[PDB]
Amino acid sequence: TKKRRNGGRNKHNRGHVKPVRCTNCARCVPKDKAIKKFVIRNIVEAAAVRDITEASIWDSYVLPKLYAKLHYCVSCAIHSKVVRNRSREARRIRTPPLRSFPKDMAR
Amino acid sequence: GKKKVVDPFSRKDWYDVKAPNMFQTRQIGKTLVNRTQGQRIASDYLKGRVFEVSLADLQKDIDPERSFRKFRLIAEDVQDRNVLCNFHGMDLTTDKYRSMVKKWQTLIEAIVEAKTVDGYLLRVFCIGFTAKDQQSQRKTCYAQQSQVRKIRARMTDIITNEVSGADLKQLVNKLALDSIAKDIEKSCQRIYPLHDVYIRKVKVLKKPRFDVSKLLELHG
Amino acid sequence: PVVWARVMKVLGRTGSQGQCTQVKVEFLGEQNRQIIRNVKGPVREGDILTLLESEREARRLR
Amino acid sequence: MNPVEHPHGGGNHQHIGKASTVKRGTSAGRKVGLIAARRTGRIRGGKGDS
Amino acid sequence: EIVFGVAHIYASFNDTFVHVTDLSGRETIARVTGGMKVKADRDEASPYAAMLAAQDVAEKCKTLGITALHIKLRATGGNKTKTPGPGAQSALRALARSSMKIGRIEDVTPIPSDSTRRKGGRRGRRL
RNA sequence: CGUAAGACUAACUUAAGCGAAAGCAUUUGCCAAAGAUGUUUUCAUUAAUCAAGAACGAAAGUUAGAGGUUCGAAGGCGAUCAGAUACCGCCCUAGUUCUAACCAUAAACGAUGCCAGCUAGCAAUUGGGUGUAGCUACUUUUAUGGCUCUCUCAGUCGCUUC
Secondary structure, three states: OOOOOOOOOOOOOOOOOOEEOOOOOOEOEEOOOOEOOEEEEEOOOOOOHHHHHHOOOOOOOOOOEEEEEOOEOOOOOOOOOOOOOOOOOHHHOOOOOOOOOOOOOOO | OOOOOOOHHHHOEEEEEOOOOOOOOOOOEEEEEOOOOOOOOOOOOOOOOEEOOEOOOOOOOOOOOOOOOEOOEEOOOOOOOOOOOEEOEOOOOHHHHOOOOOOOOOOEEEEEEEEOOOOOEEEEEEEEOEOOOOOOOOOOOOOOOOHHHHHHHHHHHHHHHHOOOOOOOOHHHHHHHOOOOOHHHHOHHHOOOEOOOEOOOEEOOOOOOOOHHHOOOOOO | OOEEEEOOOOOOEHHHHOOEEOEEOEOOOOOOOOOEEOOOOOOOOOOOEEEOOOOOOOOOOO | OOOOOOOOOOOOOOOOOOOOEEOHHHOOOOOOOEEOOOOOOOOOOOOOOO | OOOEEEOOEEOOOOOOEEOOEOOOOOOEOOOOEHHHOOOOOOOOOOHHHHHHHHHHHHHHOOOOOOOEEEEEEEOOOOOOOOOOOOOOOHHHHHHHOOOOEEEEEEEOOOOOOOOOOOOOOOEOOOO
16 A cells, blocks of 8 residues: 655656665665755864864864765665654654754764 | 985975965965986976965964965976966865855856956856845745846856956955955845855966066066 | 873773773873773773773764 | 689688788788788777777 | 975775875875775774874874875765765874874865766665 | 866755656757736637547667767676575676667556536645835835735645544
8 A cells, every 4th residue: 555645755746856876875766765864074073173173273273064965775774774664653754853962973 | 227215305305385476475385396307307397286275374364264265376487496386276165165055045156257358268156145034934045047047147247347357466356355256246136135155266277378577576 | 001091981881791881081181182982891980090092082982 | 712812712611721810011912811900800899089 | 384284184985095295286295094004904994094004194294394284085985975984084183193283174075066877786785 | 287088967956846748957049839827908619528540758679870988787707605697896798878760668656537616724835916115235215126924816735634
C-alpha cells in the first residue's frame, strides 16, 4: 500500500525532476527524494580554538565557517543515522523539532 | 650536468615583494628565488609570480573588518632586490561568498566585461541578494525574474560607466572604497530593496603593455 | 614527559568497556587551555597524574 | 599476383605470409603493404588530436 | 617583523599534505606529508600523523626563518567529498603550539558549477 | 602560473513555476507560441468525448557523419571467497556529446481518463486585479518600488475531521 501521501517528496506539477549524487554512497537519487544537510561547521573544533587564537596576530581573528550540503541516498542516510525508522504516527511530522540543543554536529 | 650538492636553499636569494602607488604601504612580504646564472636568470624566473594578499592587511585596519577581500598582484619587474607586483585582479574570500547563500532570498549575478582607457580588459562580477523587509512574516522575499533582469540591466550600465574611467589608479581606489557598491545599491532600490552587494571577482584577462614609463608614476 | 595532569570529571566507561573512563585534564601553569584526554583507570577527583603527551585530545567524549 | 611481381604474391593459398608493415627506409621495390606503420588494427578509441 | 608563508594543508582522506610554500606558491619548502612518517597504509588518515608531520615542517621553515604564515585547507572535493578529513586541523593545533604566528585560515577547496560525472554508476558503492 | 579541449550548468532550489505528456536551470539578443487575470470587446452554439487515423514521446538500442573530458555494460587484470563470470579497485571499448534520420517502449505512476454541476474547515504560496495617506525608497512628500493586513479570480499544496 501507499506508505506516504508524498511518496518521495514534492513530485507535483513536475512529472520528473533532476537527480543529484549521494555523498557516502554516490548514488543518483532525485533532488527532492534526498536527505539534504546544509552543514555549517567551525573549522577548528572550537575546543582547539584557544591554541589558534594565541597565534592570531589580529583582533583574536574570528574564525571562518565550513559550508557544504550533504545530498544523501536514503539507504545511506539511515545507515549513517541522519534519519531513522520513525513510528507510523511520528512518520507524519515534518517541521518539528529544532528544539534540541546548541549547535550540533560540530561538536 | 647540474647535480646540486646539499641544501638548495643556500643558493636562494630572498626578494621582498612591493606594492604600487595605489592606496598605501609598500612592502608586503618576501619570496625566495634561485641564484643567477647564464641559463637560469633570477630576473625571469620571477615575473610569473602571482602574489595572493588581502586588502585589510594592506589598508592597515588594525582591526581587520575588510578582511574578506583578497586581491592578487602579479610580479612584473625585478628592481633593487624587491619585485614590484603590479595589479592582477580583485577576488573575494571563499567564506564570505559561501557564507551569504542562505536560501529564502534571490541571488542576482552580473558577469560584465569592459576595459579602461588603457587596455586592461577586465571582467567584473556584481553579486547581490534580496532582503526581507521587516514587518513581513513571509519567509522568502523573492524577486520576479523580470525584476531580476531589470536590475541586472542596471548593474551592467553603471559599472561599464565606472570601468571606462581613467585606468586603475581611479578604479581600484573605487573598489577600495566599494564606491560602486554604494551606488549599485541606492540606484536599484527604485526597482527592489537590495541586500549586501559584493563585487566578488575581477579577472584582468588582458594586459596592454609592459612599458615602465607608465609604471614610474604608478610606482615611485 | 612528566608533564603534570590533574582531573576535573570522570565519565562513562567508553572505549566499549575497557573501562576507559575519560576525563578533562587540568594543568598547573594555566586554567583555561586545558582539555580532554581519554585515559584508562578509575579516577577520583584530585588524582594528580603526570602525562607524556599534551597534544592528543581524543575528541569523542560520551 | 605471382612472387616475381610483388612481395605478397605467391603461395598456394593466397596470403601475405610475412608482416605487411614494412620499415621506413626499406627502399623499393619492397616498400609495399603498410609503410612505416605506427599501429594497426581497428581503432577502438578517441584519438582526434584536438 | 612580518614574513609570511602559506601552509597549503591538503587534508584529504588517507593522507595529509602539509606542504608550506612561499607566498606565491611557486617555491616550496619542506614537502612533508603524513605519508612519509608512518607506513601502514591505514593510519595515514589519522590526526596523529597530521600531528607530528605538521610541526615537522615547523622546524624546516625556521631554517629559513619565516615567523608568520597562512593556511589553505583543501578537502579534496572536486566531484568528490568537499570537506576535510580526520587529520584536518589537528595539523593546525600542531602548528600554533609549535611557536608560530598563524593568521589566515581559508577553505580553498574549489567547488564546480556542476560536476562532469563522478565514479560509481547510479547505484554506487554497493557494500 | 598557464594554454587547449570536450562535458556539466552546482550553491541560490522551494512541497515554487512552466509544459499536452515525455521534459525544462550560465547570461544576452532575436523568433514564434501559451495559460491566467482584466474587459457595460467581437461572433452566436460554433461546444463534449471519442473507434479509425494523425503529431509528440525518458533512457537504452540502431543507421550516417562530426566529436571524443568525465563516466562506463562488454572485455582484461587484483583481491575476497569452499566457489565469485559478482559486489570493492585500476586503465579503459560501444555508449554519454552534436547533427540528419529511425525506433515507440518506462513503476511513461497520482499504479487514480476528459468536459460539467454540487458539497468545509484551516493555513500557506504562484499569477492577475482592486480599496488600506497600512507602511514606505526618495526627484519634495506625491508618481513608483518593497512589504502590511484586507478582499478577489484560477488554482496548487498542506493539515483536521464529515
